[PDB]
Design a protein around this ligand. Structure first.
Ligand SMILES: Cc1cc2nc3c(=O)[nH]c(=O)nc-3n(C[C@H](O)[C@H](O)[C@H](O)COP(=O)(O)OP(=O)(O)OC[C@H]3O[C@@H](n4cnc5c(N)ncnc54)[C@H](O)[C@@H]3O)c2cc1C
Ligand SMILES: Cc1cc2nc3c(=O)[nH]c(=O)nc-3n(C[C@H](O)[C@H](O)[C@H](O)COP(=O)(O)OP(=O)(O)OC[C@H]3O[C@@H](n4cnc5c(N)ncnc54)[C@H](O)[C@@H]3O)c2cc1C
Lengths: 461, 465
């Protein structure tokens, strides 16, 4: 082959397609019985299907009467909801399969191992091996669930669960504890809170969400608290164990203090994910890892070994499907002899709660930390005509712009359809646009996108 | 006054606020008891409130069981739906009146008339005339409902209605005939169809929507047809009259000959709106109108009378609220001595049906007529992960780009949230970007906006998905 990709998550599968379109003969080596990796199988896709259906459940209970639409107390058919989740996964998995066949990409089921000298071994569950040969190898093995630092935790996937078990619970738990107030914890904890679980989120940091913009994260926390989610922030989990029919979670203040124990029927552990390297034979092959276990790479995605490249969640940068796909495209282009580029300054991030959160570019914390003087413009959806007509008035758009040049440096949206609207700000930033330029662009009225224009005008005036 | 604005429609109101923010002393002359003109009182705002409510009604009936949410048979409370429409109208109108207070803008209730030479007369309901003077007058009088080419029709606003009556029907009609297959006809027709009317759209052109890109308009017709709306296209209406307690529309094929009569409980006349200059005294002032009744203006929005300007639905260009507002800002900036500019090449248009339709830039018919060689990329929502998760898979994005330079010339979206997603294509076109520029911008996965990225990539080369 011209290229062997090891893994078929977003980064690898897109890399394989792009390379195939650039005329290469490609093989993709994958353990899993389906393509699509974490995102399509056990990540973005299933959780988005549950988020959508649970949101429609919530809206049926609370958002229809003020519109003149009178329904009897909505009832949940959880199995039917899970069948929607499954059908959505199957569409996405089959879509990959169809794309590999369209593009004549050869798929190999089994565990791949990097040998070094343009060789890769594949071993299928039946035990037999095959050596494949290729001029280029891309490692695209993705990430795995992490545990809790210093705490031993036994995942059983019914009581102590990872996101995988939490997507497939057999019944709405009466109560659920989410360890980790990052994107995955808050999204899954909203799903179950909507369906009737009493949900508490326990988080090490004093704030939810990673280094997302502090103001937006605090506003999200406030809204999710109104939706009935309890938060225990600055809390160091020291134990999470099955206990009887449920589980027990022990935590104490991070800064020291008396311990608390909480009981719940289910505990979701959703701490940061980690690069997945085990099994690739990297030590023997001479592929160097950094101190966090990431495959070390240069700016051309090349590892310490010639002809071997790495992308996606197994290397540095945000662990996001679309980041991984953009790297897959760049490395394919690089291998075909074009320079490939990923613009690391304009990668949007979205949290699919309601309100939805979306960001691109810098946060206030990053600008302050860099000593950059900036201007802030904010416009609330309560002042927007479409938000009012749809009764979706929570949240705001904030634009950050350089003090001296008015260049937009970041935009952050909390509110309905945030993860769609952020793209007009991503496009603006690709052109080095100013807040003036954004605010002067004609936006249709009445649309929620008018709040992005208004925020930009506020930043400029 | 530095500035007198005649009309408080979106053009005139925004003009007034910008002017005030630029340091000017502004009066607004308005006949209606409330501000906001057509868009906020009888136009965009109430329409969008009924469209959202009536769509939630349809989703409650049809869109919940497949997701595991059991609600039996939802009931319409028309009174409460209308109450949401009126609440939305009230916040928008009260908002305009707040911004006038905050910017120290004076309002005068009455009919404004352009006298020339710095003066405007205001006649109130009582018959008293006050004469206001200002260095600048902006005509922002908006538009009115049009009739049917050479057919007389007597609007009564319960059986033979314009958009105004259609927004406030006291009960769901069994049947409604809408004359005009433009944006307003399709939107209002959709509202009542969802709430249980049998709806039929009768339209002179062989296509619904303008004016708008042909493939998109054709796809929308197809979807609305599946939703139970009937279309009689290529149809000339020769009569529309009460046959108490309902109404009767007669038409014949524009090209052929044989006539048809159709009865319904309510008939909506929704043909193109027209500029409203009634009461301004323009002939006596010397302000030249064109053949279509529009105020003639130059590049600075200035009429044939020095110091008299016009913006909005009364002058050339798309009759859209955000267009009127853009003109309102530009002219306030011009009058202050600054470079007011409106980019007519980038003014998005949105049709709030389901599926929603949005366009910016050129349509394929425009490019073909101009002889421009172009490339097309299209990506369907059936291939988008977020659209699948939300069961909102109808429609597509289409990007049109110059054959030689790859510069994006137009973009067109039919599907859920189209009027929001059109803005990243508007931004791209504002900077003169190419489809490659747009297709290589990182878009979050899974979002419906990824279909815009993939449609751009297909324009430039090939899509990935
Ligand atoms: C609940 C959840 C929700 C998420 N939501 C989002 C979201 O909304 N948006 C977003 O951008 N990101 C989201 N993510 C993260 C997203 O799943 C990852 O960013 C994305 O899947 C990474 O793509 P990848 O190709 O880097 O690796 P992965 O998708 O993890 O897949 C690579 C593949 O390698 C396989 N593999 C590993 N070792 C071998 C070997 N030795 N031989 C053969 N095959 C191997 C694995 O089986 C896997 O299929 C979510 C993650 C989770 C857990
Ligand atoms: C049902 C419907 C739905 C619509 N939906 C949309 C949409 O979704 N999006 C969109 O962009 N556009 C929409 N429009 C069109 C939009 O309403 C108009 O393009 C917009 O309102 C124009 O603003 P303006 O400055 O041009 O005038 P107008 O909004 O018409 O305001 C002009 C004002 O001048 C007043 N006036 C007139 N003559 C005099 C006088 N002699 N003295 C004093 N006052 C006077 C009038 O009473 C009026 O208030 C819709 C229209 C209708 C009917």
């Amino acid at each position: 082959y011209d290229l062997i990709v090891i893994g078929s998550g977003p980064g690898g599968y897109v890399c394989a397609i792009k390379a195939a379109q650039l005329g290469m003969k490609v093989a993709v080596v994958e353990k899993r019985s389906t393509y699509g990796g974490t995102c399509l199988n056990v990540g973005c896709i299933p959780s988005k299907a549950l988020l959508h259906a649970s949101e429609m459940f919530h809206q049926a209970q609370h958002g229809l009467e003020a519109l003149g639409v009178e329904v009897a107390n909505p009832k949940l058919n959880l199995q039917k909801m899970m069948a929607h989740k499954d059908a959505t996964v199957k569409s996405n998995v089959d879509g990959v399969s169809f794309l590999f066949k369209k593009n004549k990409i050869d798929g190999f089921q089994g565990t791949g191992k990097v040998l070094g000298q343009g060789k890769v071994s594949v071993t299928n569950e039946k035990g037999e091996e095959q050596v494949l040969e290729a001029k280029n190898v891309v490692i695209a093995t993705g990430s795995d669930v992490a545990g809790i630092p210093g705490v031993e935790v036994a995942f059983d996937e019914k009581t102590i669960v990872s996101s995988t078990g939490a997507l497939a619970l057999e019944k709405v738990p009466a109560s659920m504890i989410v360890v980790g107030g990052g994107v995955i914890g808050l999204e899954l904890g909203s799903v179950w809170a909507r369906l009737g679980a009493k949900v508490t989120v326990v988080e090490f940091l004093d704030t939810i969400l990673g280094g997302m913009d502090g103001e937006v994260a605090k506003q999200l926390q406030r809204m999710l608290t109104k939706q009935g989610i309890d938060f225990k922030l600055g809390a160091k989990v020291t134990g999470a164990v099955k206990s009887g029919d449920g589980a027990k979670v022990t935590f104490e203040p991070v800064k020291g203090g008396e311990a608390t124990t909480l009981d719940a029927e289910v505990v979701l552990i959703a701490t940061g994910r980690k690069p997945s390297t085990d099994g690739l034979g990297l030590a023997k092959a001479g592929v160097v890892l950094d101190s966090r276990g990431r495959v070390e790479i240069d700016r051309h995605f090349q590892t310490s070994i010639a002809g071997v490249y790495a992308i996606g969640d197994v290397v540095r940068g945000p662990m996001l499907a679309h980041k991984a796909e953009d790297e897959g495209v760049a490395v394919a282009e690089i291998i075909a002899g074009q320079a490939g580029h990923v613009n690391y300054d304009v990668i949007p991030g979205v949290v699919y709660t309601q309100p939805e959160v979306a960001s691109v570019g810098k946060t206030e914390e990053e600008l302050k930390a860099a000593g950059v003087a900036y201007k802030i413009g904010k416009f609330p959806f309560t002042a927007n005509g479409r938000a009012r007509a749809m009764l979706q008035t929570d949240g705001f758009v904030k634009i950050l712009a350089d003090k001296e040049t008015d260049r937009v440096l970041g935009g952050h949206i909390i509110g309905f359809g945030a993860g769609e609207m952020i793209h007009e700000i991503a496009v603006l930033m690709e052109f080095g646009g100013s807040s003036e330029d954004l605010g002067r662009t004609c936006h249709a009225h009445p649309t929620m996108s008018e709040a992005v224009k208004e925020a930009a005008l506020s930043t400029f005036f």
